[PDB]
Amino acid sequence: KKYLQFVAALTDVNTPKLKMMQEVSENFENVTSSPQYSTFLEHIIPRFLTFLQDGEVQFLQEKPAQQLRKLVLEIIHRIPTNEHLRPHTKNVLSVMFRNVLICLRIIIELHKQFRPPITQEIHHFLDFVKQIYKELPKVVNRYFKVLAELPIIVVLMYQLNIHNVVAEFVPLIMNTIAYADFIAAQIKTLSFLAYIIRIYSQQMVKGMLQLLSNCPAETAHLRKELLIAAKHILTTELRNQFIPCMDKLFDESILIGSGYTARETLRPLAYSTLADLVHHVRQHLPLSDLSLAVQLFAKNIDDESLPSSIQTM
Amino acid sequence: VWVSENFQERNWKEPKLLAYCLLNYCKRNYGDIELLFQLLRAFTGRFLCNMTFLKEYMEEEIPQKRALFFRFVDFNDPNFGDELKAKVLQHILNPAFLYSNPESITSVFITKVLDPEKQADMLDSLRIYLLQYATLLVEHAKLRRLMTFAWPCLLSKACVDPACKYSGHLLLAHIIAKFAIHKKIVLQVFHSLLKAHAMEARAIVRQAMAILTPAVPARMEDGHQMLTHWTRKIIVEELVHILHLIVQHFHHLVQHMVSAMQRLGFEQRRLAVDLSEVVIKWELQRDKQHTDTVVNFLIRVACQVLSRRCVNLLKTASELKLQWFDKLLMTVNYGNICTGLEVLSFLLTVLQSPAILSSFKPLQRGIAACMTCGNTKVLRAVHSLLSRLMSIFPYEELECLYAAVGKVIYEGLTPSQLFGTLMILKSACSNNPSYIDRLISVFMR
């Protein structure tokens, strides 16, 4: 029932009725699971191998044959891999070399299937992150898209580093603002690269404060992770003194979630981190800063709209 | 002075007092022009002492006059207010209309729907409040027009802010409730509400589901049973309560649902019991599918340490006792405590389950090397497991098997050793009045 309906269309699909015949293999293949890895050893490998040979990456056109690209990523997803992935590791790295969506699905698939096997996997992404980071000067030359979003989750999964440390604090001193989605994605990028604190020069103060003051208030899934990351970086017990000695705490205004959504759900999170920040040093606070700190703390004791857990703290 | 010194705060009793002076001024006869300016700095400014001061008075303000309340209170042509002033006005306006009748309101709505006028000044939650106000005037009391003015946030590329985006869908489901059978928006709202459901959308979808819940399943005449894919999208690529609260109130998808629900469940631990309620309601409303379902669930509860409610469902409802309960072979102390508190649970609830008489050899194999050492340093299970033992066995080699296991336990008495040995003999005597008298002399000593 599912043996003669797929083998007789190898050269037809590879070298273009075909589209409707291919679109029916969406939820009808999982039922026909009679072969348990015994027949599909080398039967499926050449299938997607020839599929990726076609399907050009011409982004300037208005999707001439991108329906086939959507179809091939839909059928590749339903293959669990346990053995013989050395050809796969030699095949999946050719899609991020050059409507950037095919690489997102592939990088997700390899992220989930990596656990059962073990490989060193050091072949390409040793200086690739460097090229991505040095493409930022080209970004500001063009504008003032989906290529610099996920270099880190692979690294985070791989780390279950000196060359990586230098690449971390380089983009934190440039990309200064002199939008719709560019600025939202731009801030989203520095949020990921500053989230890594698993490795452990006071060159990160200016970069982190600029994004906090220019944080887009229209988004709701951006300030939550940013404040959570800010909570993590103050719990190192060693680097909690470098940051509260240069800015002189000029962020005592409504810039930590101003708007409507950010002051309702994660409202206690901003004050809890601020309370933790003061509790860290408690040694280099002058009289003027202490007078301002108690003035801000005297207003949270009266806010009877939120549960009194913060007032006890 | 109230207009002028507003920037002084951002000499301490002035905000307490000047508002209190205007408090009594409007309490004399009515509020016509002074009512709209006494809120100029009341709810805004982040004051240390201006909360729960005017709040009680609005609920007491309502107790012929509220019929025409909108025209002489709401607009008034201020030319000085902004978004914050409009919000403060609608906080006190909602209770006035919520507690409460002429036919002259029709012209009011025509004037009301002419607010934007090609200019979108709003950049805050004022849109949500108007939609909530629009729902209040419709549910508690031109239909084509109000559909057209709620258009721009019913898209997928615009209306970035989730609060105003979900409110547009919220009002769409509230309007179409009785007989508005369409071809596009009748199902567009159904498969767009549970898209990218964040943690702050629960308070929005809670009232956005019950309006059309008893209607969509009754109006599936033009449907194609395309609800399995919509459920699959949120159960594979992505809460889970949105898929079961409809079932809580009240065949072709059970095969996929069971596989999906048993895969997603593996700090999200308070969902397995809720799924048991959904399953037990399916059986009550109605076992080729409950066999492996209950086996996996008993594994899930065994992985927890909801204990009382899951036991209640078990008593009001082969491979289970072969692969998981063989933990005492190696066991460390905390695991025995968890095991001891767990063996007391299910062994007490299987006294009225026809399963021991049908298959008990696998049960003995699992507890083969578990009962020999399951009598020391345990106070909870050991002290009470005897009561369940007298109601199991009452055939030859198996009988001698635990008899050999039994005799190697209480024949080395020579005080937990005395506590365990004495308790077992009481169980042995309670098993049957017959007892040999070839070992009494040891007991006398």
Swiss-Prot record, chain A:
<comment type="subunit">
    <text>Interacts with MYC, E2F1 and E2F4 transcription factors. Interacts directly with p53/TP53. Interacts with GCN5L2. Component of various HAT complexes. Component of the PCAF complex, at least composed of TADA2L/ADA2, SUPT3H, TADA3L/ADA3, TAF5L/PAF65-beta, TAF6L/PAF65-alpha, TAF10/TAFII30, TAF12/TAFII20, TAF9/TAFII31 and TRRAP. Component of the TFTC-HAT complex, at least composed of TAF5L, TAF6L, TADA3L, SUPT3H/SPT3, TAF2/TAFII150, TAF4/TAFII135, TAF5/TAFII100, GCN5L2/GCN5, TAF10 and TRRAP.</text>
</comment>
<protein>
    <recommendedName>
        <fullName>Transformation/transcription domain-associated protein</fullName>
    </recommendedName>
</protein>
<comment type="function">
    <text>Adapter protein, which is found in various multiprotein chromatin complexes with histone acetyltransferase activity (HAT), which gives a specific tag for epigenetic transcription activation. Component of the NuA4 histone acetyltransferase complex which is responsible for acetylation of nucleosomal histones H4 and H2A. Plays a central role in MYC transcription activation, and also participates in cell transformation by MYC. Required for p53/TP53-, E2F1- and E2F4-mediated transcription activation.</text>
</comment>
<comment type="similarity">
    <text>Belongs to the PI3/PI4-kinase family. TRA1 subfamily.</text>
</comment>
UniProtKB/Swiss-Prot annotation, chain B:
<comment type="function">
    <text>Adapter protein, which is found in various multiprotein chromatin complexes with histone acetyltransferase activity (HAT), which gives a specific tag for epigenetic transcription activation. Component of the NuA4 histone acetyltransferase complex which is responsible for acetylation of nucleosomal histones H4 and H2A. Plays a central role in MYC transcription activation, and also participates in cell transformation by MYC. Required for p53/TP53-, E2F1- and E2F4-mediated transcription activation.</text>
</comment>
<comment type="subunit">
    <text>Interacts with MYC, E2F1 and E2F4 transcription factors. Interacts directly with p53/TP53. Interacts with GCN5L2. Component of various HAT complexes. Component of the PCAF complex, at least composed of TADA2L/ADA2, SUPT3H, TADA3L/ADA3, TAF5L/PAF65-beta, TAF6L/PAF65-alpha, TAF10/TAFII30, TAF12/TAFII20, TAF9/TAFII31 and TRRAP. Component of the TFTC-HAT complex, at least composed of TAF5L, TAF6L, TADA3L, SUPT3H/SPT3, TAF2/TAFII150, TAF4/TAFII135, TAF5/TAFII100, GCN5L2/GCN5, TAF10 and TRRAP.</text>
</comment>
<comment type="similarity">
    <text>Belongs to the PI3/PI4-kinase family. TRA1 subfamily.</text>
</comment>
<protein>
    <recommendedName>
        <fullName>Transformation/transcription domain-associated protein</fullName>
    </recommendedName>
</protein>
